Copies of this chain bind each other. A is one copy, B any other.
Amino acid sequence: PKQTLDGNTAAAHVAYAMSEVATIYPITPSSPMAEIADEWAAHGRKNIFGKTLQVAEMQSEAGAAGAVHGSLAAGALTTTFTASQGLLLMIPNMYKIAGELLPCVFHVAARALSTHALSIFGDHADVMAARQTGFAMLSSASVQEVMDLALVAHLATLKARVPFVHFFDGFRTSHEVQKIDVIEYEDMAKLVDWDAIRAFRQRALNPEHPHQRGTAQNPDIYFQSREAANPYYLATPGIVAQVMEQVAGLTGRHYHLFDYAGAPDAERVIVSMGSSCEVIEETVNYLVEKGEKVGLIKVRLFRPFSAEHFLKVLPASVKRIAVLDRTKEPGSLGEPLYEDVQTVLAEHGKNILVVGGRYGLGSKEFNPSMVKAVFDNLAATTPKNKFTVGITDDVTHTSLEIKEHIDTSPKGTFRCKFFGLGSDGTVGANKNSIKIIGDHTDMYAQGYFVYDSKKSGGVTISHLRFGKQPIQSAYLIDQADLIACHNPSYVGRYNLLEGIKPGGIFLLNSTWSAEEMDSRLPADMKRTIATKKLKFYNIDAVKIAQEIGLGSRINVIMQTAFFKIANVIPVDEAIKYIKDSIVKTYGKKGDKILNMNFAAVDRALEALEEIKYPASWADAVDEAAATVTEEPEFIQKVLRPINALKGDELPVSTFTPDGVFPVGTTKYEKRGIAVNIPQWQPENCIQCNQCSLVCPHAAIRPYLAKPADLAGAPETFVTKDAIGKEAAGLKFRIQVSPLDCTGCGNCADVCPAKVKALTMVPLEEVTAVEEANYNFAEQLPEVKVNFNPATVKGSQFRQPLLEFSGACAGCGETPYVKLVTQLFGDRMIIANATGCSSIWGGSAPACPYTVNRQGHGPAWASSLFEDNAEFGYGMALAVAKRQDELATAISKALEAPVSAAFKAACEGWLAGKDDADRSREYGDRIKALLPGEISQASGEVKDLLLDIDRQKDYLTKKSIWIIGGDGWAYDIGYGGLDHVLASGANVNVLVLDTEVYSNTGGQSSKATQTGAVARFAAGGKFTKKKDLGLMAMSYGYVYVASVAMGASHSQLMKALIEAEKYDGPSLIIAYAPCINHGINMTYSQREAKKAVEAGYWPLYRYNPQLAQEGKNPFILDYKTPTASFRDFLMGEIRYTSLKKAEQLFAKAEADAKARLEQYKKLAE
């Protein structure tokens, strides 16, 4: 049958049918494969064995790989899905699985490896890192090929006994939606070699016919034993070839080990692999028809590399070959595929000039214009070798010049771009539009979706294609017949109408009339509309949704507007298909919700009005650009073009060679995405600063100023007298940053005044006023104040060093990290695990960590997902070594003829170098005496002072903070965290416990509670939550504390300060509410208060220092809960969606009572 799927679903479809067990672990962009396999098993989909697939989630891909190995050796057909860093961790087991000749298929959504930077996007770096393990390797070039070649892999591995890696390009194919022919399970079972399966069962570990495998071997037999598998690898090419003929007879689609396309007498041929083959064949069709003698060899079976099957499809007329590798091996002579082609042609004496290049790293665009550039390089007198395509390499001059732009799209193919807002329904509607068109017409349909790094308020760009011919355009849309803008704020911000065809359609969602078009639309946009004679349509979708009662949801409205003008299908047919999908989507919502969406369709058709623009729009002239402010060179050359969606134009000379970025760059973004912003009521404010404490974006802060410093304040900068003996004679004001606020509403909810001192007002109404207000508050001079930093009020007067990050509105993680920077950020180094905290904390080119007025601030680094604890441990060793080198130079200065005041500060530092306050005090004293002491010295004594000055950045004692999520701490990095805590080093571990893998969409974890439903746990998690805090207490010398900011501000303050001062390992497990819980983020602080009050989350502190004082180390800070446990679960969707459901809710309540009663015994 025909369905609209992506590569992931296409792969999981075949993997599910052919497997009994699937051990999985989430990693983008492979996790959708494991998610859908869990849902199918949850609803009882049967594989070819008549049973449901058993899905088991491990603690890491290393654990997943071992489970695959054991399951295979014991007699169960087992598969798994992974990519990128996950595939690296499976490499050790891959040698074993291949070495033991076990049938197996790994499905890989090929993704780049973390080098100078992390990239979740697609290339072959991961697959190439395992090409020597002995696995076979099969490449799929399209979503249709994923369906077919996944079947080829599963059938071939049973026959050959050689395990397979079936890989397809991450995102470019794994997330591309296409209408394909789906192969029925019943047809798969008719092709399976059942004799091969039964032989596999007989080789299983079984005590009734036992055997020994995996022995240790001496040099006398190891080499021979390793070569004994030679026949199995020699027979694999023919086995795969015969399987491809089986699939060919069933589907009609013919695959070979290497496939050729292009002129039979071609002289220039490109050898490539993966989705690039689709782009190359489309270009080859275009060039061959124009008379060029070019061709393409698609590599399907990369390993084992069959020389016979490669030469079989190479035309005898080939004189020059360009090999394209989607990877980079630095310092290597050439990339993998290039060296293979060069080798095989040498082994057979072919006089063919071979040239290799690199493309598409990290989902870099690879379009037909680049393909011609590769072909033109083969047509040159001396073809450039070791080249790159798709970048401008102005440093080493490896890039090919893209001279001209060609349009190789098949005639009759419709192309549309949709600019949407984060979670406004645009992407979901386009997926439904593809499903509508694919199911009811003969046209092929394709969809690809570009997402934003910002988690809330980001830009989404949808790329859709429909045509009478199969769609091989695995690249972004170049010339669009229709461009739709579902957010009017994008007008004048992004190049929306880029590349639109003459006479194309421009659909806009805005409240602007035809006359307001002259003043609202920019001149460059008006020129394109007029010169290209576009059909410009406008619709006020927001007005329609308000009047009907759908709020601001415009997804149904904008989809109706598309079909009305696109002329892809009859307008009357589309309306039926839209309303039919509404019944499928809103049928269970009720009669009221159903008819509202029906009215949305009807009202949208009548409201879509074509804008009749004057022809004089073609001559419009840009308006004079204002005098731009002097911004740093990085902001001007890097951050602005990247946020302007022009980062691909930046040449190689723009970037550092090691991925090092400046700090404090998010303050230049000023996204202004808030719908409402807090307005401060000075008369109701008690000056408690709790609003600044809970802000997940540091958008609201308190400001103090002497009355003289309030001179040039705007009239709206109303201040109040400062409360407290510390701030006597000063003015106070709570000021919000309107362009950086997210409109989450946490600060208004936490305000404890009798009358609310914060009220949510629309941004547009007060944006002009509050911007000048914030610009004045930010320019206020520093005020020396003696407020105790150990209190909530006093700590918020210190500058936040984490601001304006990309976390969601109301995130429960950033308030914890923001508070740490306010206490110790002056002297801390952060080792941050991969996860949400690394995405909002370190997504290029914007850095949310900033500096104070002295230029000091946290240094931030992210290594890997699994190594963060050991990463920070290594930092502690190095910092200790750097202080030791400084202490030696200071002790040498004591014997030098230096000033008596210099010797006093040196001795004071040497005695207190391991104390935070004393080392800063005497450290700053030495800094003040350094310039004068150097001037008064000469010769070797001056050199000794210059060495101290070179190391003055290590006088102040540092504070190592190891930050990461619960998935890192409870699963993949738990072994390393256990080791670093047990070592006794002076490190501080902060676990942001969201009880799921939050960044990757919300998958199951050991931090997930009993009965909670998450991805990979569709039926709910049976086993209870692992108690990480209890295991760290078992050492006795590890400080462990469980905190929750929403529950108790004072309890969080005490545990953080006690943990940092403790000269040893400290573990802070913080409850972080998240969007994956299925709750209203406006009341994110309130949800954490209900969690502790209902006995769901405990609050305790284990202080090893109390044991040395003869006291009880365990202190239970909240003993008696006052709220109902069952009522808290019903306030989050992650528990209500389960409603077998009642049995799990009862087990969760029994575990919460036993956990509280166990803490009462440890406290008594």
Contacts and interface: CB of A to CB of B under 8 A. Distances in A.
B864 A114 contact: yes
Interface string A837-864: 0111011110101010001111111111
Interface in A71-106: 71-76, 78, 85, 88-89, 91-93, 95-96, 98-102
A74 B874 contact: yes
Nearest to A645: B220
Contacts of A208: 855-856, 952-953, 956
A96 B863 contact: yes
B129 A100 contact: no
Given A216-B119, A659-B99, A950 B198 contact: yes
Interface string A215-249: 11111111111111111111010000000000000
Interface stretch (A26-34, A144-152, A542-550): A26-34
Contact of A215 (B233, B338, B842, B1026): B842
Nearest to A119: B222
Nearest to A872: B70
B861 A213 contact: yes
Interface string A869-886: 111111111110110110
Contact of A132 (B214, B329, B867, B879): B329
Contacts of A361: 222-223, 226
Contact of A342 (B223, B346, B455): B346
A976 interface: yes
A225 B659 contact: yes
Contacts of A62: 866-867, 870, 976
Given A331-B136, A864-B85, A873 B228 contact: no
Contact of A1000 (B31, B205, B826): B31
B74 A85 contact: no
A874 B78 contact: yes
Contact of A73 (B207, B228, B861): B861
A56 interface: yes
A347 interface: yes
Contacts of A118: 214-217, 838, 862
Contacts of A647: 218, 220-221
Contacts of A213: 658-661, 860-862
A112 to B, nearest CB: 7
A856 to B, nearest CB: 5
Contacts of A662: 211-212
A343 B347 contact: no
A930 interface: no
Contacts of A26: 997, 1000-1001, 1003
Interface residues of A, number: 226
Contact of A979 (B63, B214, B395): B63
B875 A74 contact: yes
A655 interface: yes
Max count, chain B CB within 10 A of own CB: residue among A162, A870, A872, A956: A870
Interface string A641-666: 01000011011111111111111000
A219 B362 contact: yes
Interface stretch (A384-392, A490-498, A590-598): A384-392
A210 interface: yes
Contacts of A343: 333-334, 338-339, 342-343
Contacts of A129: 91, 132
Contacts of A393: 224, 227, 230
Given A67-B871, A953-B208, A99 B114 contact: yes
B21 A878 contact: yes
Given A118-B862, A205-B829, A974-B59, A224 B642 contact: no
A128 interface: yes
A1114 interface: no
Contacts of A657: 101, 228-229, 231-232
A46 to B, nearest CB: 12
A116 B225 contact: yes
Given A663-B211, A863-B214, A63 B976 contact: yes
Given A26-B1001, A98-B330, 7 more contacts: A73-B874, A100-B660, A207-B958, A213-B862, A215-B847, A231-B395, A339-B339
5 contacts: A59-B979, A63-B870, A74-B878, A233-B331, A347-B385
